[PDB]
């Protein structure tokens, strides 16, 4: 039913005749149907925080009470879509209204009802068969790349009374009907879910499998796990573009979700102008990753409730795909700007300001949001595993990690990649700092490496230890100069520079190593650490002799080997197959063995 | 069109500061405009600050002095505030609320636009691309502005940020390697400075392009609140409907934020950080983010907010939030000003996050990015050497360091220093840059590629 | 073991009562069933912030950093449900765990917990980043019932002196490090070098410990003596002669 507006003071509208309204329900205020959220009740009145500008609302304006809290509409048509945080489809608003503005109080259906989809019912299901929350009663052929799986809503169950035969249907068609305790329920391809309620899962599981990014520095030294959580400092010259695009194009994530959560205007324009242009190879054909990516993108002048709802809308879409059993990867583009949206809403509500001005519950909200991540055994009958990997960025003030948003983010998250404008300046792409960066999933992933890449773990330890050693050898050089270092630590320095320049450095625009498979990465680091150990052996076993070996001897004697190691990059996975690259690296190992032996 | 006749109430039930409370109002609108007649015949506008039931709280633009119950009448205009927009207002000077103050006619509207406008659809916004040249070398060469960028000129109280703004207004234009328009909007500008703007633009021939809004320091602070929105509404008309590249120069956004504070306190909200409202971020965003290029329309809106940073504290809410929303910063610097350099634009902390789109072949010239990088590097190394000189002494300096000191001198004296009425195209700024970079032999210009050094360096 | 779980996304206001459920079960087991109960309360920071959430919604008078004015009383209502009772064989040890925000021990949660509890075991980033385990930075740690829980006939009779001397030597070693940060190795005298040697061997031998290593109190005291022997007697100013002459030599 309708209430009526009884007051308006800025965004705070006060509505009478709303006896039954539910707290935190959404309402459509005014003749233009501006969105508002019931932030309070009193008697039979209600206070409605109107998201959009209230200029022009008048006393007596009808208030249409939406039946559901801030919710996302989940169904076919999400993929390739662009949404404001409130789930307003911008790529349909602009097209339908032929205007560059978001009409005040627009009411475009989030998922188009007009477009027909191809629906194939689950062959086993029939009338009378029992069906439970999360079951897949059919598949919608959304794309060449995402076979959408139509699922019963959680909290819905019963006996099948009608299942539509295979054919063309749209979100408006009742595709299934089920019966429970005699009560009947009709289900179309589109369900609804509150953005602030965690979608249920049969069982969460330990994050256990690598999230490949194709970047060597990320996949080797600082892994994230499908279902893990990550942080990325966002800055001007750092180049978060690299991580976002690597996850979108080359990650093993079956689906990608982006969140803007209040970017700058033109900064968001860049993302929306780029992402459609990105492409991925699938089954030997070039495909646009917008067949597997959805963008909750919005700028800073959009409603504050839109910026704050962006994180939750994104994570709810990602949980929908997780439930279907895909390995979603959800990237938030500034949780600092989302946190400022939160601070603004708290200020509008006049809550007590907590640490450094942010609300009392910023830490709890961040904790719950990231906790929504994870690798789960999805609900429902067809056994499935999905995941949602939250790679949300955070924007410290000038690199100061002490502000509440960054500090809580680094306390909650388990991986942190620390992109560095200084390395970008030095022309080191990726700009991963490899000293501030860290990954807490290494213990969890030892299980996987001991199965697939048995020899990667010692190489990881040794590489990080080499680089940490160099961190002090540099100060030794400053104190007494490079000529003053023992030969062993000279070898440390030259191999560390080799790793910096030809392992951790990866030009992302080349064909050969835009994407670096993990077998190639472990092979590269294996050969480099083999050289390190062999040089250390050569120096250490001749320290007891007059024929003591030196870095100068090693370089002048093995320049070919050093050039080969430096060139290991160019081995192209697309043309030089796995077997060929493995054999080439093993041949490099053979040549290096022979060279060290002939020196010895 | 609104046919129905307006209701005029004598039912004033209170007058509390800048607010007049009217009761028994029929279906009040929020943000409705009101024209209220004082007992003595005077007239004052007001905006319905709040509404509840049969009550309406009218923020009278001018003070409430002389208002009373029982004799003040209050006509309700039945609609929100709307600005009349045309091209005719290109080449006019208006006060804070759209009233002409150049002794011209009242604007004959081509349309009536709601001054709050709507947010540009992020899926319709486009990347800025080509350059807007301001003539001021210190920002054309080193901090160029792409069409659609929002870049604020930070400055402390007393620095010539107003003079720099006037120079930008008088000189700006397309790179012309004629559909350009300017919307100046002075908020809280004292009478002498407002007169400076008006007479300067009138005298230096630029008035054909410039629509100038003035909210004098002693005009109503609500008119200050609505001035930036009038400016930007005209800018949106001239850009996304008349398809001409607009440059919006909002002046003293600190004086705007003070008016925002006054209106909040009038609403009786509790203060946020440093006394400013909590929603100042959304509000400043609503002002700034009415900018940028839009797909399918050959116009755009560039902005150059100008900020008086209190206490020179870059952490203060105004500059902090403005940095969050905008895409750069141009520092007007007190040490340069005291040394009597103009424009005292300190190019070391200044930045333009979208300069990389406004330069290059076909937009300014092949060597723009390289010359900018090299000038920045040599300027910074020169500042380093100048700090070191006083410690080690001049004769302890190497010849290269003397080259850098000479470059520092001539960069602060020939490139940064411009004089108010000297207009340098971007090409001229680049050639001055080269005349400075030739202080060094080519091998020292390490950030310039050889393919450029060989082409431009000689002569 | 009897677990109560309020995971990160479970309701916030329920954390207010979760500690009280846990301590009520602990009291039923200890004071009526006579078990020796050890209570753990994980992330009393995540509790105090639930407290701040409710108190803010109530608009109660705030203390420091927005936390309610009565957080001391509430934290004490939790903590002071510990100790042993006359005539009842059970006990309720408590080991609250709390995340000090920004590692700032002046933050209201750690500060009030310090005023209410009987000590604190302080876990240190400047050691965890060096990969010492456990990273217990003893210098700000405290245990108010050590003074009576140690001595003759309970553990050993050197325990108090050994502990006090290790505290003093550790403190002076830290001060010597802070001094060499200014004046470099050259300016240090042999006594400062002795203290730095003690500090190194203390963080390497005494603090550093296997995650599954179970050192007896006697082993810990003997390892303390191996370090006190780094010094000549007269630099062990906190230990009296009767103690020194018996334990120092061996």
């Amino acid at each position: 039913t309708f209430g009526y507006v009884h007051g308006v003071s800025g965004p705070v509208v006060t509505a009478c005749d709303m006896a039954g309204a539910a707290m935190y329900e959404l309402v459509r205020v005014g003749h233009s149907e501006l969105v508002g959220e019931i932030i309070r009740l009193e008697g039979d009145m209600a206070t409605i925080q109107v998201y959009e500008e209230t200029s022009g609302v008048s006393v007596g304006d009808p208030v249409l009470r939406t039946g559901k809290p801030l919710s996302v509409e989940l169904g076919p048509g999400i993929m390739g879509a662009i949404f404001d945080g409130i789930q307003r489809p911008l790529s349909d608003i602009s097209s339908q209204t032929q205007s560059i503005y978001i009409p005040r109080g627009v009411n475009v259906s989030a998922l188009s009802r007009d477009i027909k989809w191809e629906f194939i019912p689950s062959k086993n299901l029939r009338v009378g068969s029992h069906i439970t929350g999360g079951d897949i009663y059919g598949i919608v052929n959304e794309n060449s790349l995402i076979k959408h799986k139509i699922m019963l809503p959680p909290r819905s169950r019963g006996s099948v009374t009608y299942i539509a035969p295979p054919g063309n249907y749209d979100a408006s068609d009742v595709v299934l009907e089920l019966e429970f305790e005699g009560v009947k329920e009709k289900l179309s391809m589109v369900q609804v879910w509150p953005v602030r309620q965690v979608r249920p899962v049969t069982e969460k599981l330990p994050a256990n499998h690598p999230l490949l990014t194709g970047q060597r520095v990320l996949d080797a030294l600082f892994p994230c796990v499908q279902g893990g959580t990550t942080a990325i400092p966002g800055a001007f010259g750092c180049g978060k573009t690299v991580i976002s695009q690597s996850l979108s194009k080359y990650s093993n994530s079956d689906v990608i979700i982006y969140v803007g959560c209040g970017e700058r205007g033109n900064e968001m324009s860049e993302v929306l102008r780029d992402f459609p242009e990105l492409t991925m190879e699938v089954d030997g054909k070039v495909e646009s990753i917008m067949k597997r990516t959805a963008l909750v993108a919005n700028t800073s002048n959009m409603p504050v409730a839109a910026r704050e709802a962006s994180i939750y809308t994104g994570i709810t879409l990602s949980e929908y795909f997780r439930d279907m059993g895909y390995h979603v990867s959800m990237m938030a583009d500034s949780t600092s700007r989302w946190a400022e949206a939160l601070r603004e809403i708290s200020g509008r509500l006049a809550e007590m300001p907590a640490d450094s001005g942010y609300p009392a519950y910023l830490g709890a909200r961040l904790a719950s949001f990231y906790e929504r991540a994870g690798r789960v055994k999805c609900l429902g009958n067809p056994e499935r595993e999905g995941s949602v990997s939250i790679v949300g960025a955070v924007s410290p003030p000038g690199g100061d990690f002490s502000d509440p948003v960054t500090s809580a983010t680094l306390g909650i998250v388990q991986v942190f990649w620390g992109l560095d404008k200084k390395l970008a300046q030095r022309k080191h792409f990726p700009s991963v700092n490899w000293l501030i960066s860290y990954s807490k999933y290494m213990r969890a992933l030892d299980e996987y490496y001991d199965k697939h890449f048995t020899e990667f773990v010692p190489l990881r330890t040794k590489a990080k230890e080499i680089l940490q050693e160099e961190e002090d050898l540099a100060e030794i050089v400053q104190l007494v100069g490079k000529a003053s270092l023992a030969e062993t630590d000279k070898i440390t320095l030259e191999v560390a520079k080799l790793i910096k320049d030809d392992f951790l450095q990866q030009n992302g625009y080349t064909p050969y190593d835009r994407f670096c498979p993990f077998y190639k990465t472990v092979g590269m680091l294996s050969n480099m650490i083999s050289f390190y150990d062999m040089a250390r052996r050569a120096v250490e076993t001749t320290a007891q002799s007059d024929n003591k070996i030196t870095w100068s001897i090693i370089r002048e004697h093995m320049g070919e080997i050093l050039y080969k190691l430096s060139s290991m990059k160019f081995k192209d996975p697309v043309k030089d197959g796995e077997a060929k690259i493995k054999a080439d690296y093993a041949q490099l190992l053979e040549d290096m063995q022979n060279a060290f032996r002939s020196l010895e | 069109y609104l046919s129905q006749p307006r209701l005029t109430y004598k039912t004033v039930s209170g007058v509390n500061g800048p607010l007049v409370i009217l009761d028994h109002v029929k279906f009040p609108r929020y943000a409705e405009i009101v024209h209220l007649t004082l007992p003595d015949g005077t007239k004052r506008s007001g905006q319905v600050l709040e509404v509840s039931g049969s009550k309406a709280v009218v923020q009278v633009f001018e003070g409430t002095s002389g208002i009373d119950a029982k004799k003040t009448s209050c006509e309700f205009t039945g609609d929100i505030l709307r600005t009349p927009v045309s091209e005719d207002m290109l080449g006019r000077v208006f006060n804070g609320s759209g009233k002409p103050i150049d002794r011209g006619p009242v604007v004959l509207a081509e349309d009536f636009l709601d001054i709050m406008g709507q947010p540009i659809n992020p899926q319709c916004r486009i990347y800025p691309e080509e350059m807007i040249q301001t003539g001021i070398s210190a920002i054309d060469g080193m901090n160029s502005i792409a069409r659609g960028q929002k870049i604020p000129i930070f400055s402390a109280a007393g620095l010539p940020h107003n003079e720099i703004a006037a120079q930008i207004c008088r000189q700006a234009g397309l790179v012309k390697k004629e559909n350009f328009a300017i919307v100046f909007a002075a908020m809280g500008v004292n009478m002498e400075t407002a007169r400076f703007f008006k007479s300067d633009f009138e005298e230096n021939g630029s008035m054909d392009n410039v629509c100038l809004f003035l909210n004098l320091a002693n005009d109503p602070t609500i008119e200050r609140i609505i001035t930036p929105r009038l400016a930007l509404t005209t800018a949106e008309f001239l850009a996304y409907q008349c398809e001409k590249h607009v440059l919006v120069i909002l002046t003293d956004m600190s004086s705007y934020a003070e008016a925002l504070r006054e209106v909040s306190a009038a609403r009786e909200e509790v203060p946020g950080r440093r006394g400013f409202p909590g929603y100042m971020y959304t509000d400043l965003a609503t002002i700034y983010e009415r900018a940028g290029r839009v797909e399918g329309r050959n116009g755009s809106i560039t902005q150059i907010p100008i900020l008086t940073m209190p206490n020179d504290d870059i952490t203060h809410p105004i500059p902090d939030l403005t940095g969050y929303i905008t895409e750069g910063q141009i520092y007007v610097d007190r040490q340069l000003h005291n040394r009597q350099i103009y424009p005292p634009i300190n190019v070391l902390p200044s930045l333009s996050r979208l300069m990389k789109s406004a330069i290059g072949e076909g937009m300014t010239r092949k060597d723009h990015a390289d010359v900018s990088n090299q000038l920045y590097a040599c300027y910074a190394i020169g500042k380093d050497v100048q700090a070191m000189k006083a410690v080690v002494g001049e004769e302890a300096l190497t010849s290269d360091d003397l080259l850098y000191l000479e470059f520092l001198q001539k960069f602060e004296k020939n490139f940064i220093t411009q004089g108010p009425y000297e207009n340098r195209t971007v090409y001229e700024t680049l050639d001055i840059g080269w005349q400075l970079l030739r202080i060094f032999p080519k091998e020292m210009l390490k950030r310039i590629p050889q393919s450029t050094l060989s082409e431009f360096y000689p002569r | 073991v009897c677990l109560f779980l309020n995971l990160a996304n479970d309701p916030t206001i329920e954390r207010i009562i979760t500690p009280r459920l846990a301590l009520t079960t602990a009291e039923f087991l200890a004071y009526q069933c006579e078990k020796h109960v050890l209570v753990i309360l994980t992330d009393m920071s995540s509790y105090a912030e639930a407290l701040r959430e409710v108190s803010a919604a109530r608009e109660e008078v705030p203390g420091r950093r927005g936390f309610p004015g009565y957080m001391y009383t509430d934290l004490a209502t939790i903590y002071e449900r510990a100790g042993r009772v006359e005539g009842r064989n059970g006990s309720i040890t408590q080991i609250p765990i709390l995340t000090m925000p920004n590692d700032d021990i002046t933050h209201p949660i750690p500060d009030l917990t310090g005023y209410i509890t009987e000590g604190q075991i302080y876990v240190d980033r400047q050691l965890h980043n060096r990969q010492i385990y456990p990273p217990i930075n003893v210098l700000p740690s405290l245990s108010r019932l050590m003074k009576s829980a140690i001595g003759e006939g309970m553990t050993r009779k050197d325990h108090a002196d050994v502990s006090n001397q290790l505290y003093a030597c550790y403190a002076i070693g830290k001060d010597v490090q802070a001094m060499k940060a200014v004046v470099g190795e050259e300016a240090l005298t042999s006594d400062d070098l002795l203290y730095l040697e003690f500090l190194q061997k203390f963080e390497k031998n005494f603090i550093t410990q296997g995650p599954y290593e179970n050192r007896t109190v006697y082993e810990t005291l003997d390892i303390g003596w191996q370090l006190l022997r780094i010094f000549p007697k007269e630099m062990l100013k906190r230990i009296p002669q009767s103690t020194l002459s018996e334990f120092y030599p061996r």
């Binding site: 006049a350 007590m352 300001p353 | 009786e268 509790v270 203060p271 | 608009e59 008078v61 705030p62």
Partner: peptide
């Protein structure tokens, strides 16, 4: 902030007391 919030609440209560 707390003092001003308290004053505002007391003014609201005064409105309720008067009306």
């Amino acid at each position: 902030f707390y003092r001003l919030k308290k004053i505002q609440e007391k003014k609201k209560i005064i409105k309720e007391k008067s009306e």
